[PDB]
Amino acid sequence: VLSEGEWQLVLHVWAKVEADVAGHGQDILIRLFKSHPETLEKHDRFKHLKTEAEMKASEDLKKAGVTVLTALGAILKKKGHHEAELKPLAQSHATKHKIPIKYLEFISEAIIHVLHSRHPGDFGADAQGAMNKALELFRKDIAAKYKELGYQG
Ligand code: HEM
Ligand SMILES: O=N[O-]
Ligand SMILES: O=N[O-]
């Protein structure tokens, strides 16, 4: 559990993300791919990209970032009561895309990095700690679902 104040910290900084979902998505995916290049291999449409500029110019990458953040924002807004939203995501990520937990850790790291970089006043120790808890809970619960589906990733 997060407290209600922790949830509110999460959603307060999220509202900043919602002002420009695509640009935040671009920064987060580029951070993920630069930090953990093996992750890029999972995206057949754009796995050939090399430079930061190429990544910024890619329509497909920009769409992917919005796809992620739209889903994740809907998850966060449930304040832990997200089983229904996690169900389809676990299904595709376990059985189709095969995204291991370690990669969800990497993207969680990238999200934290970008929020700290862009919104430090809204991302002090309080809010960092609350977002860390929120993303940990997402990963815990998705991991259980993965296993239910037969995927030990
Ligand atoms: C916060 C974590 C994540 C969220 C909320 C998320 C969400 C989504 C959603 C909503 C879709 C479209 C529907 C679906 O196929 O389920 C999608 C597709 C996909 N996801 Fe994720 N995702 C996450 C993390 C990741 C990571 C870390 C990777 C790869 C390293 C990944 C790889 C893919 C792939 C390969 C697709 C298919 C389309 C594509 O190639 O771009 N996802 N994801
Ligand atoms: O690489 N996240 O889709
Ligand atoms: O709590 N989600 O499976």
Side-chain angles (χ1 to χ4, degrees):
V1 259
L2 276 74
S3 66
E4 180 55 26
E6 286 169 326
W7 287 118
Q8 292 181 15
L9 297 169
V10 170
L11 295 180
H12 178 80
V13 67
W14 204 265
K16 310 303 294 283
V17 172
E18 296 178 81
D20 182 1
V21 176
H24 284 82
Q26 285 175 305
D27 287 356
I28 290 168
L29 292 184
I30 290 169
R31 176 64 179 191
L32 171 65
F33 301 147
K34 287 306 185 177
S35 298
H36 304 285
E38 61 279 22
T39 61
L40 181 62
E41 302 179 18
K42 295 286 185 175
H43 287 280
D44 280 355
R45 279 199 247 77
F46 57 81
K47 65 177 176 193
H48 63 288
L49 300 168
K50 294 170 181 180
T51 67
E52 185 161 7
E54 290 176 329
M55 289 180 185
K56 291 174 180 282
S58 172
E59 295 191 20
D60 288 333
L61 186 158
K62 188 168 188 173
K63 293 171 170 174
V66 172
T67 290
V68 168
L69 294 182
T70 298
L72 183 58
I75 290 157
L76 292 173
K77 288 174 189 179
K78 295 306 288 200
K79 310 230 266 255
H81 290 92
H82 53 222
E83 194 181 343
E85 289 73 30
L86 261 46
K87 187 182 169 70
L89 192 66
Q91 202 277 146
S92 64
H93 285 60
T95 80
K96 180 173 183 170
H97 312 321
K98 302 160 181 198
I99 305 310
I101 298 294
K102 61 175 174 199
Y103 289 5
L104 298 184
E105 288 177 326
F106 296 157
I107 200 170
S108 297
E109 294 155 9
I111 292 161
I112 289 174
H113 172 85
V114 170
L115 293 179
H116 191 266
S117 291
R118 292 179 78 149
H119 308 300
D122 300 309
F123 216 64
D126 53 359
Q128 289 167 31
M131 184 60 74
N132 182 55
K133 292 185 196 192
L135 301 176
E136 280 179 349
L137 175 62
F138 163 74
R139 297 193 303 275
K140 175 182 184 283
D141 285 349
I142 215 180
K145 225 76 225 329
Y146 273 11
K147 288 177 183 71
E148 284 194 1
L149 298 168
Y151 180 57
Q152 304 294 326

mmCIF file of all heavy atoms in Angstrom, residues 5 18 24 30 32-33 38-40 63 86 109 111 124 132 137 141 143 153:
data_model
loop_
_atom_site.group_PDB
_atom_site.id
_atom_site.type_symbol
_atom_site.label_atom_id
_atom_site.label_comp_id
_atom_site.label_asym_id
_atom_site.label_seq_id
_atom_site.Cartn_x
_atom_site.Cartn_y
_atom_site.Cartn_z
ATOM 1 N N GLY A 5 -1.579 10.218 0.615
ATOM 2 C CA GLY A 5 -0.707 11.388 0.327
ATOM 3 C C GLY A 5 0.315 10.915 -0.693
ATOM 4 O O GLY A 5 0.679 11.703 -1.564
ATOM 5 N N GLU A 18 1.139 14.748 -18.279
ATOM 6 C CA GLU A 18 -0.061 14.826 -19.131
ATOM 7 C C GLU A 18 -0.146 16.100 -19.947
ATOM 8 O O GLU A 18 -0.857 16.128 -20.961
ATOM 9 C CB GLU A 18 -1.341 14.665 -18.311
ATOM 10 C CG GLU A 18 -1.450 13.275 -17.649
ATOM 11 C CD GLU A 18 -2.723 13.195 -16.805
ATOM 12 O OE1 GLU A 18 -3.820 12.953 -17.361
ATOM 13 O OE2 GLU A 18 -2.654 13.399 -15.486
ATOM 14 N N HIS A 24 7.290 13.623 -23.188
ATOM 15 C CA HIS A 24 7.773 12.806 -22.095
ATOM 16 C C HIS A 24 8.056 11.399 -22.524
ATOM 17 O O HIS A 24 9.022 10.786 -22.072
ATOM 18 C CB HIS A 24 6.742 12.800 -20.917
ATOM 19 C CG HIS A 24 6.752 14.063 -20.116
ATOM 20 N ND1 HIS A 24 6.075 15.194 -20.505
ATOM 21 C CD2 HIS A 24 7.385 14.368 -18.958
ATOM 22 C CE1 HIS A 24 6.329 16.150 -19.609
ATOM 23 N NE2 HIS A 24 7.033 15.644 -18.633
ATOM 24 N N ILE A 30 13.901 7.085 -25.158
ATOM 25 C CA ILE A 30 15.307 7.297 -25.535
ATOM 26 C C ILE A 30 16.206 7.003 -24.353
ATOM 27 O O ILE A 30 17.247 6.347 -24.549
ATOM 28 C CB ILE A 30 15.471 8.735 -26.044
ATOM 29 C CG1 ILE A 30 14.757 8.847 -27.386
ATOM 30 C CG2 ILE A 30 16.895 9.099 -26.180
ATOM 31 C CD1 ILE A 30 14.593 10.280 -27.905
ATOM 32 N N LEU A 32 15.664 4.876 -21.931
ATOM 33 C CA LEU A 32 15.664 3.420 -21.785
ATOM 34 C C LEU A 32 16.589 2.778 -22.817
ATOM 35 O O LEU A 32 17.408 1.942 -22.496
ATOM 36 C CB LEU A 32 14.199 2.937 -21.949
ATOM 37 C CG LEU A 32 14.018 1.397 -22.053
ATOM 38 C CD1 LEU A 32 14.420 0.772 -20.793
ATOM 39 C CD2 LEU A 32 12.596 1.025 -22.454
ATOM 40 N N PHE A 33 16.461 3.180 -24.068
ATOM 41 C CA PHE A 33 17.198 2.551 -25.159
ATOM 42 C C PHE A 33 18.681 2.920 -25.076
ATOM 43 O O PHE A 33 19.515 2.073 -25.490
ATOM 44 C CB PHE A 33 16.631 2.897 -26.490
ATOM 45 C CG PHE A 33 15.159 2.515 -26.706
ATOM 46 C CD1 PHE A 33 14.294 3.288 -27.500
ATOM 47 C CD2 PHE A 33 14.615 1.347 -26.157
ATOM 48 C CE1 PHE A 33 12.980 2.961 -27.663
ATOM 49 C CE2 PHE A 33 13.327 1.048 -26.324
ATOM 50 C CZ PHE A 33 12.461 1.835 -27.073
ATOM 51 N N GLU A 38 19.629 -3.391 -25.338
ATOM 52 C CA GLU A 38 19.019 -4.610 -25.652
ATOM 53 C C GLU A 38 17.477 -4.484 -25.683
ATOM 54 O O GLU A 38 16.794 -5.236 -26.382
ATOM 55 C CB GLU A 38 19.387 -5.704 -24.623
ATOM 56 C CG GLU A 38 19.021 -5.551 -23.197
ATOM 57 C CD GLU A 38 19.914 -4.696 -22.351
ATOM 58 O OE1 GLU A 38 20.687 -3.787 -22.870
ATOM 59 O OE2 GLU A 38 19.944 -4.919 -21.115
ATOM 60 N N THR A 39 16.912 -3.528 -24.948
ATOM 61 C CA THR A 39 15.476 -3.308 -24.900
ATOM 62 C C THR A 39 14.926 -2.879 -26.269
ATOM 63 O O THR A 39 13.785 -3.174 -26.629
ATOM 64 C CB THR A 39 15.026 -2.354 -23.821
ATOM 65 O OG1 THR A 39 15.582 -1.076 -24.008
ATOM 66 C CG2 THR A 39 15.373 -2.867 -22.478
ATOM 67 N N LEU A 40 15.727 -2.100 -27.007
ATOM 68 C CA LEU A 40 15.333 -1.651 -28.271
ATOM 69 C C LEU A 40 14.993 -2.786 -29.258
ATOM 70 O O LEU A 40 14.139 -2.658 -30.153
ATOM 71 C CB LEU A 40 16.408 -0.647 -28.788
ATOM 72 C CG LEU A 40 16.138 -0.046 -30.146
ATOM 73 C CD1 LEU A 40 14.908 0.783 -30.269
ATOM 74 C CD2 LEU A 40 17.377 0.766 -30.515
ATOM 75 N N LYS A 63 4.904 7.440 -31.191
ATOM 76 C CA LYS A 63 3.652 6.715 -30.932
ATOM 77 C C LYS A 63 3.833 5.708 -29.840
ATOM 78 O O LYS A 63 2.927 5.633 -28.968
ATOM 79 C CB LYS A 63 3.146 6.058 -32.182
ATOM 80 C CG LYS A 63 2.689 7.013 -33.253
ATOM 81 C CD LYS A 63 2.424 6.215 -34.548
ATOM 82 C CE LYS A 63 1.759 7.025 -35.587
ATOM 83 N NZ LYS A 63 1.665 6.237 -36.859
ATOM 84 N N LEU A 86 -4.252 -4.153 -15.554
ATOM 85 C CA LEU A 86 -3.094 -4.979 -15.691
ATOM 86 C C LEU A 86 -3.354 -6.257 -16.456
ATOM 87 O O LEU A 86 -2.446 -6.801 -17.074
ATOM 88 C CB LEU A 86 -2.428 -5.376 -14.383
ATOM 89 C CG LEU A 86 -1.224 -4.612 -13.933
ATOM 90 C CD1 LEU A 86 -1.372 -3.147 -14.048
ATOM 91 C CD2 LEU A 86 -0.822 -5.007 -12.521
ATOM 92 N N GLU A 109 13.101 2.901 -14.115
ATOM 93 C CA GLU A 109 14.282 3.709 -13.888
ATOM 94 C C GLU A 109 14.289 4.905 -14.829
ATOM 95 O O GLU A 109 14.601 6.023 -14.416
ATOM 96 C CB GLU A 109 15.527 2.846 -13.925
ATOM 97 C CG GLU A 109 15.566 1.849 -12.748
ATOM 98 C CD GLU A 109 16.417 0.594 -13.021
ATOM 99 O OE1 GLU A 109 17.134 0.492 -14.015
ATOM 100 O OE2 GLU A 109 16.280 -0.368 -12.167
ATOM 101 N N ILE A 111 11.658 6.289 -16.380
ATOM 102 C CA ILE A 111 10.558 7.187 -15.994
ATOM 103 C C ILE A 111 11.009 8.057 -14.853
ATOM 104 O O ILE A 111 10.905 9.294 -14.874
ATOM 105 C CB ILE A 111 9.308 6.379 -15.636
ATOM 106 C CG1 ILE A 111 8.719 5.704 -16.837
ATOM 107 C CG2 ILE A 111 8.266 7.254 -14.922
ATOM 108 C CD1 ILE A 111 7.778 4.544 -16.511
ATOM 109 N N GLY A 124 10.821 15.879 -5.410
ATOM 110 C CA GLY A 124 11.730 15.733 -4.300
ATOM 111 C C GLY A 124 11.691 14.410 -3.679
ATOM 112 O O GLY A 124 11.053 13.483 -4.202
ATOM 113 N N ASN A 132 8.475 5.656 -6.745
ATOM 114 C CA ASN A 132 9.174 4.401 -6.644
ATOM 115 C C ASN A 132 8.250 3.339 -6.098
ATOM 116 O O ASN A 132 8.227 2.242 -6.704
ATOM 117 C CB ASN A 132 10.440 4.598 -5.757
ATOM 118 C CG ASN A 132 11.218 3.340 -5.664
ATOM 119 O OD1 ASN A 132 11.589 2.762 -6.682
ATOM 120 N ND2 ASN A 132 11.393 2.868 -4.468
ATOM 121 N N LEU A 137 4.921 -1.462 -7.078
ATOM 122 C CA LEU A 137 3.660 -2.214 -6.905
ATOM 123 C C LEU A 137 3.176 -2.720 -8.255
ATOM 124 O O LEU A 137 2.775 -3.884 -8.450
ATOM 125 C CB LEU A 137 2.624 -1.272 -6.264
ATOM 126 C CG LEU A 137 1.220 -1.862 -6.137
ATOM 127 C CD1 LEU A 137 1.229 -3.117 -5.230
ATOM 128 C CD2 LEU A 137 0.180 -0.772 -5.756
ATOM 129 N N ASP A 141 2.769 -6.673 -9.089
ATOM 130 C CA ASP A 141 1.480 -7.246 -9.469
ATOM 131 C C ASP A 141 1.565 -7.805 -10.888
ATOM 132 O O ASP A 141 0.955 -8.883 -11.157
ATOM 133 C CB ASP A 141 0.391 -6.178 -9.386
ATOM 134 C CG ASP A 141 -0.032 -5.854 -7.956
ATOM 135 O OD1 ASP A 141 0.352 -6.599 -7.015
ATOM 136 O OD2 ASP A 141 -0.732 -4.817 -7.776
ATOM 137 N N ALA A 143 4.205 -9.112 -12.275
ATOM 138 C CA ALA A 143 4.981 -10.370 -12.138
ATOM 139 C C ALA A 143 4.103 -11.496 -11.694
ATOM 140 O O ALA A 143 4.264 -12.624 -12.245
ATOM 141 C CB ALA A 143 6.072 -10.178 -11.219
ATOM 142 N N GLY A 153 9.289 -14.608 -16.590
ATOM 143 C CA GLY A 153 10.225 -13.556 -17.008
ATOM 144 C C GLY A 153 10.226 -12.437 -16.031
ATOM 145 O O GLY A 153 11.244 -11.688 -16.016
#
